[PDB]
Amino acid sequence: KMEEAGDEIVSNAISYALYKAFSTNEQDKDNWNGQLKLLLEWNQLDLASD
Amino acid sequence: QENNDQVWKFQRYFLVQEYCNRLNIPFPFVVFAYFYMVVKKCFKCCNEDNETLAWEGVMKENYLVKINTKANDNSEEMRHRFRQL
Amino acid sequence: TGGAKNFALKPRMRKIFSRLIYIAQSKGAWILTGGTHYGLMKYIGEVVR
Amino acid sequence: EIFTNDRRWESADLQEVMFTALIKDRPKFVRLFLENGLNLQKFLTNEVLTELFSTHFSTLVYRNLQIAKNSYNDALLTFVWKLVANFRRTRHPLQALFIWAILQNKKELSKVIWEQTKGCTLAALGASKLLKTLAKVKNDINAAGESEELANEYETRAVELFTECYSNDEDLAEQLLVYSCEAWGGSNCLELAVEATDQHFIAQPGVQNFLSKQWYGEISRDTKNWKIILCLFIIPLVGCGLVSFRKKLLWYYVAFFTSPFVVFSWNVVFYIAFLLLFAYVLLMDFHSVPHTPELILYALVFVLFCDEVRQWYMNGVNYFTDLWNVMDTLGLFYFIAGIVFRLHSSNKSSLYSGRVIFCLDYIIFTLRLIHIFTVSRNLGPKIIMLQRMLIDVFFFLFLFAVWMVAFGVARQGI
Amino acid sequence: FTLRLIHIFTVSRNLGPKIIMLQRMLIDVFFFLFLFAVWMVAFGVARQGILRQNEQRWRWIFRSVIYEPYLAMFGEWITIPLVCIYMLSTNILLVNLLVAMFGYTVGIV
Amino acid sequence: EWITIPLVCIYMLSTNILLVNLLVAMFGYTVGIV
Amino acid sequence: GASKLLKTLAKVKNDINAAGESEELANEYETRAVELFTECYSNDEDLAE
Numbered sequence: 001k002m003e004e005a006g007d008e009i010v011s012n013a014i015s016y017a018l019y020k021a022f023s024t025n026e027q028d029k030d031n032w033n034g035q036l037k038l039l040l041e042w043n044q045l046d047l048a049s050d
Numbered sequence: 051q052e053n054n055d056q057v058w059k060f061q062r063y064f065l066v067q068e069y070c071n072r073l074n075i076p077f078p079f080v081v082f083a084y085f086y087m088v089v090k091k092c093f094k095c096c097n098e099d100n101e102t103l104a105w106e107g108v109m110k111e112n113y114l115v116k117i118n119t120k121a122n123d124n125s126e127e128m129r130h131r132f133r134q135l
Numbered sequence: 136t137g138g139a140k141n142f143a144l145k146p147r148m149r150k151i152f153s154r155l156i157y158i159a160q161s162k163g164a165w166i167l168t169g170g171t172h173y174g175l176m177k178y179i180g181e182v183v184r
Numbered sequence: 185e186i187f188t189n190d191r192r193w194e195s196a197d198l199q200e201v202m203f204t205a206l207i208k209d210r211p212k213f214v215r216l217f218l219e220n221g222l223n224l225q226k227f228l229t230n231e232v233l234t235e236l237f238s239t240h241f242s243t244l245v246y247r248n249l250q251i252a253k254n255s256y257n258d259a260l261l262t263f264v265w266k267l268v269a270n271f272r273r274t275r276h277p278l279q280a281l282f283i284w285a286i287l288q289n290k291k292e293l294s295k296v297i298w299e300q301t302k303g304c305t306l307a308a309l310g311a312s313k314l315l316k317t318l319a320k321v322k323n324d325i326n327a328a329g330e331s332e333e334l335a336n337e338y339e340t341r342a343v344e345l346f347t348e349c350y351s352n353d354e355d356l357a358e359q360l361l362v363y364s365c366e367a368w369g370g371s372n373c374l375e376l377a378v379e380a381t382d383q384h385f386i387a388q389p390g391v392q393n394f395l396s397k398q399w400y401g402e403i404s405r406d407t408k409n410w411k412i413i414l415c416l417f418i419i420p421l422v423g424c425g426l427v428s429f430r431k432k433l434l435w436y437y438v439a440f441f442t443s444p445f446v447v448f449s450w451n452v453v454f455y456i457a458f459l460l461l462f463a464y465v466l467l468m469d470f471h472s473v474p475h476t477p478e479l480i481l482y483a484l485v486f487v488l489f490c491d492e493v494r495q496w497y498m499n500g501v502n503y504f505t506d507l508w509n510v511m512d513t514l515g516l517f518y519f520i521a522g523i524v525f526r527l528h529s530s531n532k533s534s535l536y537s538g539r540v541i542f543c544l545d546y547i548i549f550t551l552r553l554i555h556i557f558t559v560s561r562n563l564g565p566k567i568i569m570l571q572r573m574l575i576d577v578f579f580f581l582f583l584f585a586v587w588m589v590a591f592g593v594a595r596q597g598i
Numbered sequence: 599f600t601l602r603l604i605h606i607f608t609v610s611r612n613l614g615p616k617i618i619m620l621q622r623m624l625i626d627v628f629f630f631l632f633l634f635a636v637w638m639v640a641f642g643v644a645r646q647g648i649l650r651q652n653e654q655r656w657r658w659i660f661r662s663v664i665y666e667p668y669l670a671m672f673g674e675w676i677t678i679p680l681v682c683i684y685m686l687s688t689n690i691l692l693v694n695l696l697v698a699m700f701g702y703t704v705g706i707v
Numbered sequence: 708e709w710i711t712i713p714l715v716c717i718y719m720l721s722t723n724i725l726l727v728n729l730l731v732a733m734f735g736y737t738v739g740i741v
Numbered sequence: 742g743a744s745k746l747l748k749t750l751a752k753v754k755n756d757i758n759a760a761g762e763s764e765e766l767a768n769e770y771e772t773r774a775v776e777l778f779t780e781c782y783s784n785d786e787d788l789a790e
């Protein structure tokens with residue numbers, strides 16, 4: 001988004017895009033371990049909590 | 051009260067650098083060194099730097115980025131969001 | 136990106152691309168581009184250097 | 185509007201617009217042009233720089249600089265004056281443009297040029313020096329104060345940059361700190377800061393750490409002093425590994441003895457031994473014929489005289505500014521009077537007088553040793569106070585003297 | 599023993615905000631005193647050479663060169679340089695004492 | 708005979724104590740002042 | 742104990758960066774412990790002692 005101008009934004013957007021791609025495709029969140037590992041790798045706390 | 055810390059450090063620098071600039075030969079034999087220099091004073095008389103400069107420029111760019119973002123982060127109000135709303 | 140030979144070196148874009156390169160370096164990723172000297176790829180090459 | 189992707193820019197024929205913006209003091213437009221456009225190095229030419237220095241250079245600033253040269257000539261100021269004269273009539277055009285911007289006090293333009301400069305910290309220190317020496321000149325307080333403020337701002341900017349760089353890397357930062365001049369000013373960053381008296385830059389943890397490391401040399405830092413002294417007194421023992429090293433026995437011993445700390449300790453010990461020998465000779469000496477220890481004392485005095493001559497050559501007239509150097513030199517020359525008096529076997533009065541000359545010179549040598557002790561102990565936050573206090577005391581003493589005479593005068597008349 | 603009692607008294611009275619200053623000041627003073635001592639010897643040495651030119655006894659020389667100036671205090675062309683050196687030495691000793699007096703003030707935060 | 712050296716040593720010690728007491732009395736109020 | 746260990750590590754000086762960071766962390770831990778202990782002392786007297 002244009003409004004977002006803070007530091008550490010590219011990593012968050014890339015991680016969100018990768019998580020969205022992994023969500024619907026493949027196992028479709030069949031195993032929580034894989035999704036948890038993927039989210040932990042990029043350090044996206046809010047999505048992990050939510 | 052503000053400048054006491056730096057002044058004495060400056061004085062320590064001056065004394066230490068002045069002494070270090072002098073020759074560091076043991077005193078009893080120091081004369082020999084001078085004699086040798088005298089010969090050199092009479093007989094004779096008669097890429098990597100670019101890499102370091104590029105690295106220093108990289109650090110300068112980082113510092114410029116930091117100082118630029120400091121002003122933006124100083125404001126605690128997001129007037130851009132209010133204007134967008 | 137930067138198909139046109141003219142690219143704008145806005146501070147926002149430069150910071151975004153620097154962050155992207157830092158992220159790639161952290162994970163040791165592969166950056167695929169066109170390789171043309173002129174344009175945004177020049178900025179990519181300069182940041183890589 | 186004008187700068188957009190649709191309006192393709194050749195960025196080759198924009199030189200005239202850059203020149204017009206540069207001369208009219210338009211820093212934001214200059215930055216915008218530099219964002220996407222020409223190369224500042226390519227654009228700059230001898231003719232353009234000469235025109236900038238000649239036609240558009242204010243006469244008031246030129247007069248101020250001439251006054252600075254006449255009154256406050258300095259190593260950097262003479263070079264900058266020569267450069268200005270040459271252009272008014274390793275090229276480093278960027279440095280010349282930076283100096284041109286600084287002299288007219290274009291803060292934003294100078295900042296932009298510094299950002300575009302290849303070497304920044306050295307340029308910042310040189311700018312601080314030049315602006316401070318210009319501020320020393322006082323024809324109008326306005327410019328004299330503005331230049332000083334700009335110098336302080338540049339000095340603090342350089343301090344921030346250097347501390348950030350030091351935090352980044354250690355060895356590369358130390359190597360850059362001592363980078364040789366590239367004809368910018370004829371001196372490195374460190375000496376340039378010393379000349380301008382940048383307390384903030386010198387009063388930095390990194391510079392102090394580097395100075396301490398140099399003051400230890402190749403001998404291991406933080407190896408503890410008592411170990412060093414024990415090894416110094418027992419020379420073979422340091423070969424046993426008592427004293428560590430920063431990074432081959434001959435190399436080890438050479439590095440240990442070349443460390444200026446060990447050199448200073450050895451010099452102090454040798455001076456104490458020389459004083460003890462002087463004391464022994466004073467009470468034991470044959471008037472008719474001197475013995476070998478007297479000749480050894482003469483040789484040591486000759487060595488001290490050679491060291492004093494070296495100090496003179498290295499320092500200059502400023503050497504005599506300190507009263508204690510003057511006292512040491514005066515005592516060394518005073519010893520020669522006793523040496524001459526001892527040269528006469530007859531004239532027992534002259535022999536006794538020369539003995540008295542030696543006797544009195546011993547005391548001043550002791551005072552010199554006392555001074556080195558006092559300086560060594562108080563090499564800390566107190567040091568400045570000490571020296572300042574010291575000079576004050578002497579004045580009062582002098583004052584006291586010039587009173588006694590008068591009293592004595594009166595007393596005589598009474 | 600009396601001096602030890604005096605020290606315990608002094609420590610007991612000044613067991614407060616001043617205490618650190620006291621101890622710090624104390625050590626400074628001693629150094630100056632030591633310095634003073636290492637000057638007297640030299641002066642005494644010189645004095646010996648000026649007065650007792652002929653002396654060839656180890657113990658007599660030792661005693662006369664050590665504790666002659668202390669007794670003196672307890673009790674042609676030389677004058678000008680002598681007074682000059684006296685002024686120089688007094689300058690050094692006085693600045694040492696004064697530095698010892700204000701030593702703690704600068705370091706206090 | 709031998710008294711001189713220990714006598715001067717104790718004189719120096721006592722002078723140290725008295726001088727530090729006087730100096731402490733001189734700056735006594737400064738530290739306590741707020 | 743963390744304050745003690747970090748301070749004694751900071752006494753060692755091979756690189757100023759870590760030597761200063763450890764000292765700062767030690768000071769932070771020391772002040773945190775001070776706050777905790779003063780709060781506990783305010784809570785109870787005999788148990789705190």
Ligand SMILES: CC(C)CCC[C@@H](C)[C@H]1CC[C@H]2[C@@H]3CC=C4C[C@@H](OC(=O)CCC(=O)O)CC[C@]4(C)[C@H]3CC[C@]12C
Nearest residue numbers: 409413445448449450452453456557560561562563564
């Ligand atoms: C009877 C004799 C042999 C005793 C002297 C033994 C030496 C080991 C003494 C004589 C002079 C002393 C030195 C006087 C000056 C200095 C530098 C000093 O450090 C500094 O240079 C400034 C910083 C500071 O220590 O305050 C540390 C002690 C040292 C080596 C002192 C410690 C030990 C020294 C060399």
Ligand SMILES: CC(C)CCC[C@@H](C)[C@H]1CC[C@H]2[C@@H]3CC=C4C[C@@H](OC(=O)CCC(=O)O)CC[C@]4(C)[C@H]3CC[C@]12C
Nearest residue numbers: 505507572574575576577578579580581582583585586
């Ligand atoms: C004319 C002859 C017979 C007298 C020579 C004896 C000197 C010891 C007198 C003469 C002039 C005096 C000086 C006149 C001016 C000054 C500078 C003054 O300090 C300052 O004014 C600022 C210096 C600074 O801080 O850098 C301290 C005393 C001093 C050396 C005075 C102290 C003693 C001096 C050198």
Ligand SMILES: CC(C)CCC[C@@H](C)[C@H]1CC[C@H]2[C@@H]3CC=C4C[C@@H](OC(=O)CCC(=O)O)CC[C@]4(C)[C@H]3CC[C@]12C
Nearest residue numbers: 560561562622624625626627628629630631632633635
């Ligand atoms: C060699 C013999 C004949 C002389 C012995 C007499 C002592 C009283 C002298 C010798 C060395 C001197 C000392 C050399 C170094 C120091 C430390 C100095 O304080 C400091 O440097 C910092 C100490 C601290 O604050 O912890 C004060 C004087 C003292 C004890 C000096 C005062 C008097 C000493 C102990």
